[PDB]
Design a protein around this ligand. Structure first.
Ligand SMILES: *[C@H]1O[C@H](CO[C@H]2O[C@@H](C)[C@@H](O)[C@@H](O)[C@@H]2O)[C@@H](O[C@@H]2O[C@H](CO)[C@@H](O[C@@H]3O[C@H](CO)[C@@H](O)[C@H](O[C@H]4O[C@H](CO)[C@@H](O)[C@H](O)[C@@H]4O)[C@@H]3O)[C@H](O)[C@H]2NC(C)=O)[C@H](O)[C@H]1NC(C)=O
Ligand SMILES: *[C@@H]1O[C@H](CO)[C@@H](O[C@@H]2O[C@H](CO)[C@@H](O[C@@H]3O[C@H](CO)[C@@H](O)[C@H](O)[C@@H]3O)[C@H](O)[C@H]2NC(C)=O)[C@H](O)[C@H]1NC(C)=O
Ligand SMILES: *[C@@H]1O[C@H](CO)[C@@H](O[C@@H]2O[C@H](CO)[C@@H](O)[C@H](O)[C@H]2NC(C)=O)[C@H](O)[C@H]1NC(C)=O
Ligand SMILES: *[C@@H]1O[C@H](CO[C@H]2O[C@@H](C)[C@@H](O)[C@@H](O)[C@@H]2O)[C@@H](O)[C@H](O)[C@H]1NC(C)=O
Ligand code: NAG
Ligand code: NAG
Ligand code: NAG
Ligand code: NAG
Ligand code: NAG
Ligand code: CA
Ligand code: CA
Ligand code: CA
Ligand code: CA
Ligand code: CL
Ligand code: CL
Ligand code: CU
Ligand code: CU
Ligand code: CU
Ligand code: CU
Ligand code: CU
Ligand code: CU
Ligand code: CU
Ligand code: CU
Ligand code: CU
Ligand code: CU
Ligand code: CU
Ligand code: CU
Ligand code: CU
Ligand code: CU
Ligand code: CU
Lengths: 671, 671
């Protein structure tokens, strides 16, 4: 496996190599401060596609196993963060900054994501130096006690208002046991200015309490005991979903159970899963998230790569937090926040479960058990089917059984469900669901344009979800073209009665040659049939292609007049196809999160006058939808209807529905 | 069971009663001749909602169990086809001609569907009068031995060009045995003007053979014998999916499958199903198709009824038949063409199968085994789910299990799979797929405007699929309103830093008061969050409602300039909402198919400027798509991602996610 995420051991060797080259002033990033030199991350560095392919096809010698490590360099006059490529594994030797090379110049230190350590200091400063200045108020409303931390904080992004900032707003919640605190915002949000390399110089720029702005906790505290701050008492406990996840009702009859009568018909051999029809390797980007490479259907490779690129979530709000939150989850990392899968709930009780080794903000490799799960799910629905009683009685059909590869990313409040379905029809399905806990704020004022009240004093904040996927199809090879077929009604006379009129239905086919005419903004209509296809024809003389069908209800992307709108330019499209370049492996950056104003990676820069006619193309799909919270989002948001994504379906790629050749396919005559 | 379909006894009772009060001139519609009198169909006349609800949930006396019977009166000077509502079953007493009452006016005979007899009468005219006149041509091109009729014809629709017609176009295909004959067009189509009441009077107005139009079979045979008809010999046999339906590859490791560990959590008695969560009555309209009534989630009725209302398939092509086919399949009968379900393919093995009785084109009611299938399906995906590793390490999930009611209709070539899935969240999903075989034509000329080549000498005719559903919700009462909520970005300077700009995300909440406001034309933007609500609010003061999330890519509906458009005016809408009037019980009629030029039930008329505020409403959803046949549709077209419909989701209808109380919910802490 050329695409097997770095191994438990491999990570160890890269780290041992680094401790040695980066000098000893290097500290474990698990407890480093702005001024320390620490290794933020180390994971698989993807091999170039050319060499990658040569190895898989000619048999040529595979490229070198490299790893990308991000190191924060605070131990220096002009601190920076840099991308260094290490290798070749398993026994490293070289190492080389690529930062400037990849991003034109030095990566500004303020863009670096917030370290685990860095968060504590913020609570440190909050629960210790700050919150006390308003204990009076707190002793009242929120049961603050002379003991501490019966409350917790929650970050938001981006940090600030213009490029170069690191000012984060933190809501305060009740530290609820065994259930989401997200639903119990105490009403207080603080704008922490944590830009200084010295935690001693961090400050509170502004405070927002139950409706109004205060310059400091003190001033607020002051006004509270002064008698001018009316407080709405927030209960610290209760019953129902708003309070617990444990269902009050005792079990009944066991829910239908899925099982393989003769055992699993697939085989996860490391990162590569192999079944009767499909074969592929899988993984998880520490930041990008789930990814699959070299997808071969019955031997033939359709896709070189289908990877998650980014996740956005723009909030509308009542308070300052909600109001400015525009999370760019990859800034946190979908791989990193991948929660272990619960056998029986997250995946069928008899699914295969795989582990995930990572080296992020730490110096020794850790593992997430059951990060992924691969299994076969009998849909209950038939793939194909036809009952004939006319002229010749017979029946032929096939009940559909699919192959799923799942993984879940729990970024703070909600959990993402990354589903990759492999159909017997040679069709590939990609879906993602947003479930778990929604982000709520304190309810005050007319609940009109920011959400609905889902529970007392708690407001479901409106927001949009949007994910981006890289779909590096290599339909029947590397050089593919984009075709756009649709329909139309041509009025014309009836050949056998020119006295009458008919609306002749015809197909409308167009070739997309320029990246632009193949980039479709969110909102505008798209061709009913859109697909990338080969230069070569399938038996009946048609270019063998694979169609791209989407399932998006995507909200409107932040207006362009927004200076951060560039931090996630991909959201403005439903789809775009470009010349898959080696210098365009990602559509977003982990750095884009903390500084969307000055994108480390701007996706719109992938679309320029270029021919997407006979080149190595890559499609970019954006799926998403508007989420106006409501009662039934308590406790968790369900997955029903909320699962968006897209399809990769063959169109004249095969000379016939291969499922014809299904072992499991059924046939008989009459009854 | 006041919604339950009529059974043998009842149908018999009505028939017995009909042949009695109808008198002497009443032949068995099975053989009945054009100028005969016969009972075309005896079905259940749906009860007036008012009294239905009056009794159902109060105690009032149940309404008169009725049955609507349709008779073709041909044996008379002024032939009409009439709708008669028969007396109180089980022992019928009265009879009323509702034709004028109901449709207002008399039903022109030429609107009557073509009886299974007329079809025979036709084949006789073809084979035993016309086909021999081209014995020479056929004996060559088509292995045509006048012996055994190795060819079969296939009706199209509508019949005629202007209203008042009955001139069908029949293509001729090989009588393949045990497979689809649709993939084998012999290039010969015919225009049988079976308008007259006397079968001898019928004639072929035009003939079409492998490209050219001719005036008579004789004229063709003549030119063939003359030498001016270069025939392309269509192979009558061969292998692959185009000939077989039975997979060649033997059975391999068995596919996974479910099973209820402690038996099924749902019971089926008659037409009513009930589980811990759901309660409802199902059934099947003869032409209307699948329908469901009195849906109660834990006792609360959400919908009075949700039924299919019509199906349509508008075609394009180079061949006359194809070139003008606009199937309003309800003119055929989705109930009527419901084929038997194959246990383990069409539905899981461990499902509950149901029969269906009917008195159609016969004098004796017959039954269809396993017409319906009800079961429970562990989806193998989670409903709600959160894994906590931040602050408090708890986990709460619930893999989703759904309840399904299915039925499959086989209208000649394709089989429609009708779904309706009730989810543990109180969301009702309606999906329908199109599978089975396509409709092919003879290949020739510049191919590209009408379809792709899917096999030797056969084209995959471009077409559109659409289906209309009557969703008559009753959100906690009959008075429901229509809300259209949706986003918008409002720029305003950053409260705490005016120098900086901000894009304030907000929600728009507009109320639809007129039917015109609520009717949404296909291809036009619709409010993201659109739903019907009650007057009454939930514990958090928001209106109690259900939103209608749509799932369709409806291809452009037939223009309006076209003479027939009105026959299926609903196809021009994605959604529309109206006042549940008892006289607007259906969006289409069985009689519309043969007279699209003079619709028996014009749907555009259901949309007049009436207030849809605080009334009993009903939504009309339209879901469909464009189908451009491709190789992978051979042997059959697969369901994968071709299932369109919609969801009925609870929106502030509950005080929370009702699944929090799932007995099957899961919770715990740590691993
Ligand atoms: C689809 O196309 C590929 C590649 O064809 C490419 O052709 C070039 C010119 C670009 O337009 C690119 O966009 C196309 O994809 C097919 O495989 C190759 O097909 C090309 C023809 O298009 C073959 O190239 C020719 O090769 C001969 C000698 O082998 C050359 O002499 C030709 O060029 C001469 O003339 C021009 C103009 O005077 C000069 O500029 C040149 O210097 C030469 O003097 C020409 O390039 C090529 O041989 C094919 N591949 C091989 C080596 O087997 C592919 O088969 C096709 N698929 C189908 C079925 O449609
Ligand atoms: C981000 O900061 C790192 C700091 O590690 C920068 O890399 C450093 O680059 C300097 C300049 O080449 C290296 O300095 C050394 O200076 C001595 C003094 O004579 C010379 O003899 C050595 O040959 C060497 O050049 C330093 O070793 C190197 N450190 C590492 C581990 O990379 C880096 O340039 C900054 N990134 C960007 C994008 O500017
Ligand atoms: C269709 O024909 C029927 C024939 O039964 C007409 O109704 C009957 O008409 C006869 C005399 O023609 C009366 O004696 C019966 O009492 C009528 N009852 C029935 C059976 O309907 C009917 O008027 C005609 N309707 C249309 C469509 O014009
Ligand atoms: C909700 O409406 C009920 C019936 O609607 C009519 O009755 C009055 C509200 C009147 O204003 C008409 O215009 C309405 O269309 C009504 O009887 C209930 O009292 C109403 N309940 C609530 C919660 O307002
Ligand atoms: C939150 O409280 C729980 C117990 O209620 C404790 O285990 C956890 O460490 C606390 N964390 C914070 C942020 O106070
Ligand atoms: C919340 O209330 C319940 C019942 O009223 C009580 O049992 C529980 O201890 C409370 N929550 C906690 C753990 O403090
Ligand atoms: C695209 O590039 C061409 C040059 O090849 C130029 O003529 C044209 O104006 C450009 N169109 C755009 C995207 O403005
Ligand atoms: C087709 O062949 C079957 C085989 O038994 C025969 O019963 C049927 O009559 C034939 N249909 C035709 C050509 O009408
Ligand atoms: C087609 O040929 C096969 C021999 O391979 C034969 O079994 C079959 O009967 C022929 N077609 C039919 C069913 O008439
Ligand atoms: Ca480009
Ligand atoms: Ca490619
Ligand atoms: Ca109306
Ligand atoms: Ca209603
Ligand atoms: Cl037309
Ligand atoms: Cl903004
Ligand atoms: Cu290898
Ligand atoms: Cu900086
Ligand atoms: Cu309160
Ligand atoms: Cu491992
Ligand atoms: Cu049958
Ligand atoms: Cu980078
Ligand atoms: Cu959400
Ligand atoms: Cu929702
Ligand atoms: Cu009753
Ligand atoms: Cu007439
Ligand atoms: Cu029965
Ligand atoms: Cu855990
Ligand atoms: Cu009618
Ligand atoms: Cu179709
Ligand atoms: Cu298709």
């Amino acid at each position: 496996q050329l695409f097997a995420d770095l191994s438990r051991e491999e990570l160890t060797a890269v780290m041992r190599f680094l401790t040695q080259r980066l000098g000893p002033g290097l500290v474990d990033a698990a407890q480093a401060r702005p001024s320390d030199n620490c290794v933020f991350s180390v994971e698989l560095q993807l091999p170039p596609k050319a060499a990658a392919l040569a190895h898989l096809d000619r048999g040529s010698p595979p490229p070198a196993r490299e790893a990308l490590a991000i190191v924060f360099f605070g131990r220096q006059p002009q601190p920076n963060v840099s991308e260094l490529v290490v290798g070749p594994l398993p026994h490293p030797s070289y190492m080389r900054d690529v930062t400037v090379e990849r991003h034109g110049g030095p990566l500004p230190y303020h863009r670096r994501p917030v370290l685990f350590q860095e968060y504590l200091d913020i609570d440190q400063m909050i629960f210790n130096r700050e919150l006390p200045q308003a204990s009076g108020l707190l002793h009242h409303c929120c049961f603050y006690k002379h003991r501490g931390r019966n409350l917790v904080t929650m970050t938001t992004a981006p940090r600030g208002l213009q490029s170069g900032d690191r000012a984060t707003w933190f809501g305060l919640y009740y530290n609820i046991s065994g259930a989401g605190f997200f639903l119990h915002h105490v009403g207080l949000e603080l704008l922490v200015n944590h830009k200084a390399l010295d935690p001693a110089r961090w400050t509170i720029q502004k405070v927002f309490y139950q409706g109004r702005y205060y310059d400091s906790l003190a001033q607020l505290e002051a006004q509270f005991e002064a008698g001018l701050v009316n407080v709405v008492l927030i209960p610290d406990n209760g019953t129902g979903g708003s309070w617990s996840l444990k269902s009050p009702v005792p079990p009944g009859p066991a829910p239908p159970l899925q099982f393989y009568p003769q055992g699993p018909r697939f085989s996860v051999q490391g990162s590569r899963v192999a079944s009767s029809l499909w074969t592929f390797s899988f993984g998880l980007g520490a930041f990008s998230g789930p990814r699959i490479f070299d997808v071969r259907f019955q031997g033939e490779r359709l896709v070189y790569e289908i990877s998650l690129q980014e996740a956005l979530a723009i909030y509308g709000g009542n308070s300052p937090a909600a109001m400015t939150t525009r999370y760019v989850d990859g800034g946190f990392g979908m791989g990193k926040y991948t929660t272990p899968l619960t056998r029986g709930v997250d995946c069928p009780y008899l699914a295969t479960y795989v582990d995930w080794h990572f080296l992020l903000e730490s110096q020794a490799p850790k593992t997430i058990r059951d990060a992924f799960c691969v299994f076969e799910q009998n849909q209950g629905l038939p793939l194909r089917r036809h009952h004939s009683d006319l002229y010749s009685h017979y029946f032929g059909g096939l009940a559909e059984t699919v192959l799923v590869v799942r993984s879940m990313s729990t970024l703070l409040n909600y959990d993402y469900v990354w589903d990759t379905v492999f159909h017997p029809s040679g069709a590939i399905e990609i879906r993602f669901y947003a479930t778990g806990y929604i982000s709520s704020a304190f309810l005050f004022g007319a609940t009109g344009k920011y959400g609905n009240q889902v529970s007392e004093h708690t407001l479901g904040t409106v927001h949009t979800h949007s994910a981006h996927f890289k779909v590096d199809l290599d339909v029947a090879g590397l050089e593919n073209w984009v075709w756009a077929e649709d329909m139309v009604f041509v009025p014309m006379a009836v050949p056998w009665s020119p006295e009458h009129q008919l609306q002749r239905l015809q197909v409308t086919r167009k070739l997309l040659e320029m990246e632009e005419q193949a980039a479709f903004l969110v909102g505008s209509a798209t061709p009913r049939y859109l697909y990338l296809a080969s230069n070569h024809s399938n038996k009946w003389g048609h270019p063998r292609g694979y169609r791209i069908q989407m399932l998006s209800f995507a909200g409107e992307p932040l207006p362009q007049n927004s200076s951060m709108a560039r931090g996630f330019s991909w959201e403005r499209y439903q789809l775009a196809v470009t010349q898959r370049k080696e210098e365009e492996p990602s559509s977003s950056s982990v750095f884009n999160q903390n500084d969307p104003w000055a994108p480390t990676v701007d996706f719109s820069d992938f679309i320029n006058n270029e021919t997407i006619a006979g080149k190595d193309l890559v499609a970019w799909v954006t799926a998403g939808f508007l989420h106006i919270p409501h009662a039934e989002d308590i406790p968790n948001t369900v997955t029903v209807g909320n699962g968006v994504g897209f399809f990769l379906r063959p169109y004249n790629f095969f000379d016939e529905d291969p499922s014809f050749y299904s072992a499991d396919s059924i046939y008989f005559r009459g009854d």
